[PDB]
């Protein structure tokens, strides 16, 4: 938790995030296209970072914005509030949203709590916790999250896991036989979710969607996420694993604005995530690939990912158990 | 500590380290050129990782090697011991060297406990702690460590710190004036030690040396390290900061073998480290640059670095306080 809050305390990290043009532009459009939803309202910005969303709320004419930030980035937000002449309208509160006092309830909660595969962020539970401050009528921005799963074919990604483990084949590394660890090295590589982008031509079926309604979801809902799937295969070939991405919708009174991390959309700093099966499955177009993706919260502000899949027409099955704490950042 | 031991638990990390050819080749030469110092002896390998140093001790004819490893890498070391037919001669002990039981005292301790700038590794104190197991006559490999400091001139590195902060000059970033944070952003960049290599032509004086004798040093000695310097300037120009590197010597009965991370030597995964002054100092050839580098252990298994320097002939002075927990990895 010291490491988590140290990470977010750096202006270099805020700069890196603010340079995702899709992320910045989409949040600004969501808030300002729905300006009637903010004008003269009370706003809570959960994990405000440098404060940009609180400035967007102010741009839309919000009367009072409580900007809550647990890292030392709170001191930098406070400098921008003063320098942009908004000490009347933005109140920066240093601390955890679970531990601070707000002097009143709010019309709307705004946040950017999304991790890789949507869920990989201790902030999303904190976002749902913040609803204790929301008036009964109140809204959340974002309002819903859709996680998308689709089967992919990519023998280059599959074969890379073996190639990276080739080091361990050496029978005389400075007189040591390393070969007994080659299997363990391959296994370790297979248990890392792969963060990068890819051509949509690797996707073999239309995605399945798991929707979280942030207006309705409770903190505890995110501890165990079970996503059944049945894919109608549109392509014939080896299925190497599942690809993951997410959309969030800001459901305003004037319009719904989408932030999509789909591989059909401009690239974001979320990229996409791929989880290999331990062994690939042959599917023909018209086959069904059925199974379950289970995300179980672990104590590392991350998730164990269990995937089981079978081709219904053959009974051929595979699985994997991955740790989203140790992702492989493959993007170059 | 969970993060530290998770990091070292990965075969991918052991592979990365084992592919530093200078590191592997130098440890093998040190041990095998001094084979008479290992033959029929009892050895302790502190933080053995995959076990390579224990295999090198075995190559030199050691009778019994206790290989102590606190991470899950201990299970992988045990697989190599079995597969290389050395269960008679190498005993893998899972746990911290501070907490485990050895059944006997040892002739020699071998380890690779060196971090950036030598000291940046919770293992070096653990290496000195291990001496509780060393026979009075006993040796340590490595035996001594030399940290080298030298003044450097590099206006490209200096100007980069301002260039990276340029983002924050924006008077209308999506309608927000970021400029009040530009100073803070520059300051943050200046407080990161820079890990990369450089041409020796940037060094303006012969290095000063701080020596740690691992045979004599106590655990507590490493909490506060004070390095006074007086440089005899050999070049005229702006001094932008201090450059750091280190050598360790394996002082065997047959020969002394050096592992050097100097910028005059083949590159290692330690590279070199540079700490900027907040403001550069003009020195002419023949001037003296005097001051102190103070390393104070912090609770992040790292060090605060305080540097003060003055050109004696002008009185012009500068300083910085850096955090070795947040280094900038600039090498490309
Ligand atoms: N992708 C996940 C990025 C998540 N960040 C959000 C950073 N906010 C941000 O960039 N806003 C501006 C923006 C600009 C453009 C578009 C969108 C937003 C998390 C932020 O919350 C902080 N935190 C975590 N847990 C808690 C807690 N319990 N209470 C209070 N603060 C907490 C944490 O220190 C950090 O500053
Ligand atoms: N540069 C710093 C790299 C430091 N590593 C050393 C890894 N050893 C290694 O590569 N040896 C093989 C080798 C090959 C070629 C040349 C040289 C060596 C630290 C290793 O000690 C482990 N650890 C840390 N603190 C403790 C402790 N208290 N007790 C026991 N184990 C502890 C930690 O998990 C990790 O496995
Ligand atoms: Na292919
Ligand atoms: Na120059």
UniProtKB/Swiss-Prot annotation, chains A, B:
Domain of life: Eukaryota
GO biological process: chromatin remodeling; methylation; negative regulation of dendrite development; positive regulation of cell population proliferation; positive regulation of epithelial cell apoptotic process; positive regulation of fat cell differentiation; positive regulation of transcription by RNA polymerase I; regulation of DNA-templated transcription
Chain ranges of the SAM-dependent MTase PRMT-type domain: 1-308
Catalytic reaction equation(s): L-arginyl-[protein] + 2 S-adenosyl-L-methionine = N(omega),N(omega)-dimethyl-L-arginyl-[protein] + 2 S-adenosyl-L-homocysteine + 2 H(+)
Signal peptide coordinates: none
Predominant location: nucleus
Position(s), cross-link Glycyl lysine isopeptide (Lys-Gly) (interchain with G-Cter in ubiquitin): 82
Keyword rRNA-binding: no
GO cellular component: cytoplasm; cytosol; nuclear replication fork; nucleoplasm; nucleus
Activity regulation field: Methylation of H3R17 (H3R17me) by CARM1 is stimulated by preacetylation of H3 'Lys-18' (H3K18ac) H3 'Lys-23' (H3K23ac) by EP300 and blocked by citrullination of H3 'Arg-17' (H3R17ci) by PADI4.
Key words of the record: Acetylation, Chromatin regulator, Chromosome, Cytoplasm, Host-virus interaction, Isopeptide bond, Methylation, Methyltransferase, Nucleus, Phosphoprotein, S-adenosyl-L-methionine, Transcription, Transcription regulation, Transferase, Ubl conjugation
Coiled coil regions, renumbered to chain: none
Recorded family membership: Belongs to the class I-like SAM-binding methyltransferase superfamily. Protein arginine N-methyltransferase family.
Stated role: Methylates (mono- and asymmetric dimethylation) the guanidino nitrogens of arginyl residues in several proteins involved in DNA packaging, transcription regulation, pre-mRNA splicing, and mRNA stability. Recruited to promoters upon gene activation together with histone acetyltransferases from EP300/P300 and p160 families, methylates histone H3 at 'Arg-17' (H3R17me), forming mainly asymmetric dimethylarginine (H3R17me2a), leading to activation of transcription via chromatin remodeling.
Name this polypeptide is given: Histone-arginine methyltransferase CARM1
Species: Homo sapiens
Source species taxonomy: Eukaryota, Metazoa, Chordata, Craniata, Vertebrata
